[PDB]
């Protein structure tokens, strides 16, 4: 027959979501126990980045013993280079860290037309200060006052005592390096038990639905 | 290190009705054998129209009724390229043609314009 709509993989929901997470609170969606939605399509015009590391994107079709994690968030154009193995900087250090041996794909696109507004969109936040670098795929959503000097802060902001999250200000007139970019990181979770719903790499005949 | 994932169509152009054209689709970042690949076309007025497809890991081909007998899809795994052979072109074959691969979702190229007088 045909799969239940509950059994279609929600890749379209990842890329087409109306709102994206702030990078410090990056969102992870597990894609599992599902088969491809043949109505979901993107082209070279959709993305400015689509790079995979150590893996073909055709692995996204193999979910019988694998889950896909789609991590998504908004950062600045000039920070997209940090969503890659072996990078350092504000995003890699304190917000979203990929491992040196990363296996998976990174997709990004310019979201100026949705995420910037006249006078600035301030709803996207990043972590600016942290006592140590994030481990790969670590997530920090704490909001403790950061002690930048030797004097303890005792929970009050001042010189050397800073609230650690700060807002991007996305204006449509910003240069492209300061415009917002939506980012989707696809990685794989190897499983020990077979999926209830999935499909083989070799075609089973689903292509006929495009000509119906 | 990284590999960019990209599909680049080429070979479009202007031909008078009854003529032929062979479109090419150079793929990057995945082996074309490992994916279901397909051609669709984008007509000025109309929505997306799938015209031809070939199986993952196999040779079974599919075609839109509107192009059966006229178009042939094929795959050169050594050149990592897919082709669309278009014969006996009719003026309502005029559209921008895209190649695409199923990677969880369809991912398509940049398009190549085909105009049939
Ligand atoms: C889920 O998202 C899909 C993908 O969105 C894109 O990708 C994401 C990742 C972001 O990067 C987005 O910014 C981006 O849009 C949606 O599909 C996309 O929809 C948009 C808008 O509907 C569509 O863009 C249009 O494309 C046509 C065709 O462009 C080619 O052809 C012309 C000649 O015909 C040529 O000149 C071009 O160079 C291209 O080669 C274009 O004509 C449109 O122009 C209009 O808008 C621009 C805005 O800049 C304006 O300047 C023009 O003057 C004119 O008004 C416009 O650019 C994307 O092509 C399309 N992408 C794909 C892969 O399909 C998807 O939207 C839904 O499907 C669409 C087909 C459309 O019907 C939408 O209304 C639907 O909602 C979305 N899905 C849902 C459910 O929301």
Numbering used by the authors:
A (entry chain B): 328 to 539
B (entry chain A): -2 to 114
What does the paper say about this structure?
A key step to the SARS-CoV-2 infection is the attachment of its Spike receptor-binding domain (S RBD) to the host receptor ACE2. S1 binds to angiotensin-converting enzyme 2 (ACE2) on the host cell membrane via its receptor-binding domain (RBD), causing conformational changes that trigger a secondary cleavage needed for the S2-mediated membrane fusion at the plasma membrane or in the endosome. Here, we identify and characterize a high-affinity synthetic nanobody (sybody, SR31) as a fusion partner to improve the potency of RBM-antibodies. In summary, we have structurally characterized SR31, a high-affinity nanobody against SARS-CoV-2 RBD.
To characterize the SR31-RBD interactions in detail, we purified the complex and obtained crystals that diffracted to 1.97 Å resolution. The asymmetric unit contained one molecule each for the RBD and SR31, indicating an expected 1:1 stoichiometry. SR31 binds to the RBD sideways at a buried surface area of 1,386.3 Å2 (CDR1, 204.5 Å2; CDR2, 226.8 Å2, CDR3, 519.4 Å2; non-CDR, 710.3 Å2) which is significantly larger than that for the previously reported sybodies SR4 (727.4 Å2) and MR17 (853.9 Å2). The binding surface is near a heavily decorated glycosylation site, Asn343, which, although at an apparent strategic position to possibly divide the accessible surfaces for immune surveillance, does not show clashes with SR31. Peculiarly, the CDR3, which contains a cluster of hydrophobic side chains that include Met99, Val100, Phe102, Trp103, and Tyr104, is inserted into a greasy pocket in the RBD that is lined with twelve hydrophobic/aromatic residues. Aligning the ACE2 structure to the SR31-RBD structure showed that the SR31-binding epitope is distant from the RBM. Structure alignment of SR31-RBD with ACE2-RBD revealed that the two RBD structures were overall very similar with a Cα RMSD of 0.45 Å. Specifically, the small α-helix α364–370 (numbers mark residues from start to end) moves towards the direction of RBM by a dramatic distance of ~8.0 Å and transforms to a short β-sheet (β367–370) which in turn forms a parallel β-sheet pair with β102–104 in the CDR3 region. In addition, nudged by the CDR1, the short helix α383–388 swings towards the RBD core by ~4.0 Å. Remarkably, the dramatic rearrangements did not cause appreciable conformational changes of RBM, nor did it affect ACE2 binding.
